[PDB]
Structures are given as C-alpha cells and as structure tokens.
Amino acid sequence: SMSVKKPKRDDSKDLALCSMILTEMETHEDAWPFLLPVNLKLVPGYKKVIKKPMDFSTIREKLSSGQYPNLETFALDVRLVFDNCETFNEDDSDIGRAGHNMRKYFEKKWTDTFKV
Ligand SMILES: Nc1ncnc2[nH]cnc12
C-alpha cells in the first residue's frame, strides 16, 4: 500500500527474454498455423466466432513497439493464440495438435525463464 514498498523482481531483462521466447516459438516447426493472422476473408466463421484474434506476428509487432506494459500481458496474448486455436479447431486435427504442442512448448519456456 502507500509507502509500503513490496520487494519486486528485477524486470530489466523481460523485454529481451520475451523476445527470445517469441523467436523460439516462431522457429518451431509446428508454428505455421500461428505465424500470420488468420485470413478473415478466406476462413468462414472465424471473424464472428473469435472475438480477439492473435498471432505471433502481431505479438512480435506489439513487443517491438512497446505495447506490452509487463511480461504478464505478453503471456496473455501468447495464450490467447492457443485458446483461439482450441476454440476453432478439433484436437484431432493438424492445427489442433499444433496448438496443444505449441502451448506446452511455451509454458515450459515461460516457467524455465521466469519462475526461479
Ligand atoms: N488457418 C486457420 N484456420 C482456422 N483456424 C486456425 N487457427 C490457426 N490457424 C488457423
């Protein structure tokens, strides 16, 4: 509270570390469904069903232009990518499987990079 300073982690490397994690995501062989925005004019249903589209290129742009206030807002957008994918795709589909794989891949890197 007011003048009750809570000790907080060093956040000086967060931008660089998030960029590193995002690069590893971008280069994963299963990243292809997520590299660019879903084409809202070629994919029926997507615009109406998915209220907040997100993809790695949009995250990369926001990261590079200071649009994430903190690392938690970055993680929210990454997770949004995979939550959208689950919403729109069957688990037993290539894109569906790609999403689960990439979510697992992200969350381990997230834990390993920032949690202890
Ligand atoms: N091309 C695509 N079509 C439908 N859902 C997707 N989720 C990620 N990429 C997609």
Pocket test for ligand 1, best of 88, 97, 100, 103 (most atoms within 8 A of CB): 88
Residues 46 and 88 sit within 8 Å (Cβ to Cβ): yes
Q: 94-114 vs 14-27: helix axis angle to the nearest 10?
A: 150
- Give the distance from CA 75 to its chain's centroid: 6
Resolution (A): 1.9
CA distance readout (Å), 72 to 5, 18, 99: 20, 10, 20
Query: CA–CA separation, 114 vs 116, rounded Å?
Result: 6
- Cβ neighbour number for residue 4 with a 10 Å cutoff: 5
List all residues 6 or more positions away from 109 whose beta carbon is below 8 Å from its beta carbon.
21, 24
What CATH number corresponds to the domain at position 54?
A: 1.20.920.10
Q: Which two tokens stand for residue 43?
A: 């994919």
Residue nearest to atom 8 of ligand 1 (CA): 33
> DSSP state, 60?
H
CA-CA distance, 109 to 79, in Å (whole number)?
Answer: 13
Give the method of determination. X-ray
Structure tokens that stand for 59 in this block: 């995250």
Helix (H) or strand (E) holding 70: none
User: Is residue 58 in contact with ligand 1, taking CB distance under 6 Å?
Assistant: no
Centre of ligand 1 to C-alpha 97, Å, is 12
What tokens does 87 get? Answer: 């919403």
Tokens of 10: 């060093």
Task: List the structure tokens of 34.
Answer: 């997520």
Residue range(s) defining the domain that contains residue 53: 1-116
Using the Cα atoms of residue 9, residue 13, residue 18 and residue 23 in order, give the sign of their dihedral: negative
Q: Write the single-letter amino acid at 19.
A: S
The DSSP 8-state label assigned to residue 43 in this structure reads: S
Domain count, the chain: 1
> Which burial class, exposed, middle or buried, applies to 54 when counting CB atoms under 10 A from its CB (0-12, 13-18, 19+)?
buried
Token code pair at residue 64: 């590079």
